[PDB]
Amino acid sequence: AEWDRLHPVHAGPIEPGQMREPRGSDIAGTTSTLQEQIGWMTHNPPIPVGEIYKRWIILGLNKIVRMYSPTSILDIRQGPKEPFRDYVDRFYKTLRAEQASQEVKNWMTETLLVQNANPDCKTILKALGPAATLEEMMTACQGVGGPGHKARVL
Amino acid sequence: PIVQNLQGQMVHQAISPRTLNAWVKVVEEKAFSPEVIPMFSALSEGATPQDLNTMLNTVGGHQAAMQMLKETINEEAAEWDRLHPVHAGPIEPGQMREPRGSDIAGTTSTLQEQIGWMTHNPPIPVGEIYKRWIILGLNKIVRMYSPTSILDIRQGPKEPFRDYVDRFYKTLRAEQASQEVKNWMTETLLVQNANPDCKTILKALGPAATLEEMMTACQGVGGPGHKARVL
Amino acid sequence: PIVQNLQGQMVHQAISPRTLNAWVKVVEEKAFSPEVIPMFSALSEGATPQDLNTMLNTVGGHQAAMQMLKETINEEAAEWDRLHPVHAGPIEPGQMREPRGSDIAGTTSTLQEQIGWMTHNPPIPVGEIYKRWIILGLNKIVRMYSPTSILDIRQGPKEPFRDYVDRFYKTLRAEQASQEVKNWMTETLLVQNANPDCKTILKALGPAATLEEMMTACQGVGGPGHKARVL
Amino acid sequence: PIVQNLQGQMVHQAISPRTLNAWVKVVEEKAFSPEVIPMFSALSEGATPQDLNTMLNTVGGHQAAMQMLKETINEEAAEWDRLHPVHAGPIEPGQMREPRGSDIAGTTSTLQEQIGWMTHNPPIPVGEIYKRWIILGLNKIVRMYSPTSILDIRQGPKEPFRDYVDRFYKTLRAEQASQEVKNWMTETLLVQNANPDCKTILKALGPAATLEEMMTACQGVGGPGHKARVL
Amino acid sequence: AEWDRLHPVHAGPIEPGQMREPRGSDIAGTTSTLQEQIGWMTHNPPIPVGEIYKRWIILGLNKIVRMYSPTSILDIR
């Protein structure tokens, strides 16, 4: 659809030494033939109908991941005996396709990662914060859940 | 501070006792709020560094807000000096010395020495640059003494969208951030703290969503956010 | 603002705290009252584009109104870039450049370029156009915030015709419907709310009757005192 | 007060009883406190000795604090003569005379002699020195009537950390110590007398953490309806 | 940044040659295409953009492996 409004197509007869021009249906493969498609790929310059259609599909797949997710970044809380490996991995898997910039990430590390942590963990994260690295933070607060992965009841 | 007069004339003259007493009352009412920033910007353009020291002391009539301005300007003075090292000695008339961070704040310079850097061609505008450090600290007091918290604005069960908005962006204005983090805040924080109705409509709207639709959202329930006072 | 409108004067004067503070409080007293718009224009006389933004930002209440108003003003400037070709002629020997929508807004322009146009012969009027964009961009919001109606107007148990016409007119001004709309409403509603002795005048001379014999009509009802404020 | 310049071709212009009431109202509202000093420090800028003395004796109120304040001015004017013998009659011919302790204080000097020393070349800063002496007085009174002592105070159970530094720093400010000693009492004595929920987070944040993020402690601690809540 | 420390380079082709020298950003696939990447690899002497990139992902994953799940070797008896 959007392609169609971006690029009008002459429908009338085509000259010799030329190929017809693609529509948004033709790029999607719907209203064109296989010999046209090989035509378009054998074009000079190349007319790369397959790269555009693929890009659309890659685009539409990242719509599904965000639409089929009720989960807010904001109100993600640690369970009763949670260790930092489950929690860090989990807050960051909610952001897959949102594609957060770094300056956002620094802001989230300061506030919500700290405040939704359980109380022993929260002191470690408060302490190293976004001034330190994530390598620092991971190993330090992994210290309250220990080698068995279990943190003292709340 | 300096005042423009006719026929190419500008004069450093003392801050009138009237100007002052009216300014003093504005500091008392508005220092801990967004409101004082465009007035400090309009006011402090004609402040020299010697004058901006006198205004900064005045603004910090509060000994917590006084500390933040004070601590920031000495850190900005340093930050300046550590970014541009300049040896900065005395020199004879006709020419000028390079200013350090301590000279731009004016503690180690005379007033005529500051006014020189400013009235020279090309200018060094020691006032604009020391205003900037001062302004940096001001944004901080506004952020501290903010009664509202952006994390804390959650719409309540009879509240319309327009009233929730009106309070969300006052909060957002008192919070200190760059544009990216603000768009985080309007995209993520404003929507996911909202009522289920509101939330549904603004996601199914897609790119067709407007601030006009946002001023009509979640209505029908009475009280604040449905009308405004005319007469 | 500029000091004077005299030809080719590049003389600029700053905005007092007090003038910025006194604007905040018109909005705090009575913000959507129709008295405030052309009051606002009066207090922003001699203004530049820069003076305009300083005055819009100082205000810290009504932030949903203020922000939509901010955006709308940037949309006028993008309308002017689309609508007008800027610099369609050839290069003119001796002439100051022509303003783009963005130079009127202030996004591509210095104070001395802005003033130059306002003090040019004949004067190219960028502050008034920037002001225009706020006057038209404000009014469209005040149409939307305002559920003012003329049709539901209150009348008492011993109501003379004197203050009713004033009440009519002020409520009608507070309404922002179409002139036609207002005339069809004013034609039907003002006559039908009249008692017999008031009614006679406007049956005969119609909706356009002199207000001298309307305001003295339905005397001796046992109304409140003199229309004068001498107490 | 002096107007038009700060240096050279400066002139008198007089202060009104309407604006003397502006001055005295600040002392009358805020009493003997560090608040009045930044207002009065910006007041006494561009002042003739004869203005300062008109300011000084229009407050009224409290005679023995007024007399104690003049004891301070007496010791410092008598100190100026002690340290620095003047020459008898004219020191140089285009100067009026070399000024004595009393001549700075205003007691023996007419307004022509006061401006006459200020428009000498280089300037002699007669009401700068006299502003410096009245300022010694106000800080000595400020201490003498102080109810809070720097080694007594601690944090309240219902007091945020921001309220706590404002208070600590007020008690510090009303007190006199070397800078070196005032750095111990801000490092150690401020930290030691804090409420524990502030003192635990400070050690774990550590020294390179910013004042911005260490100043938001002990929040909510007074109960719901608290003013401090930012992070 | 460690590559960059050791190897300052021009932004484009060098003025008499016909190809550029790879940055840190060129190693990582961030600012580089496949044609420039097999041009560094087909170069003589070979400039080892994919080998040395792989070395980083090995080094990095090695950091991770040693930081994820500590084993207690005091319970081995």
TrEMBL record, chain E:
It comes from the Viruses. It is found in: Host cell membrane; Host endosome, Host multivesicular body; Virion membrane; Virion. Encapsulates and protects viral dimeric unspliced genomic RNA (gRNA). Binds these RNAs through its zinc fingers. Acts as a nucleic acid chaperone which is involved in rearangement of nucleic acid secondary structure during gRNA retrotranscription. Also facilitates template switch leading to recombination. As part of the polyprotein, participates in gRNA dimerization, packaging, tRNA incorporation and virion assembly. Interacts with host NUP98. Homotrimer; further assembles as hexamers of trimers. Interacts with gp41 (via C-terminus). Interacts with host CALM1; this interaction induces a conformational change in the Matrix protein, triggering exposure of the myristate group. Interacts with host AP3D1; this interaction allows the polyprotein trafficking to multivesicular bodies during virus assembly. Part of the pre-integration complex (PIC) which is composed of viral genome, matrix protein, Vpr and integrase. Belongs to the primate lentivirus group gag polyprotein family. This is Gag polyprotein. It comes from Human immunodeficiency virus type 1 group M subtype B (isolate NY5) (HIV-1). The gene is gag.
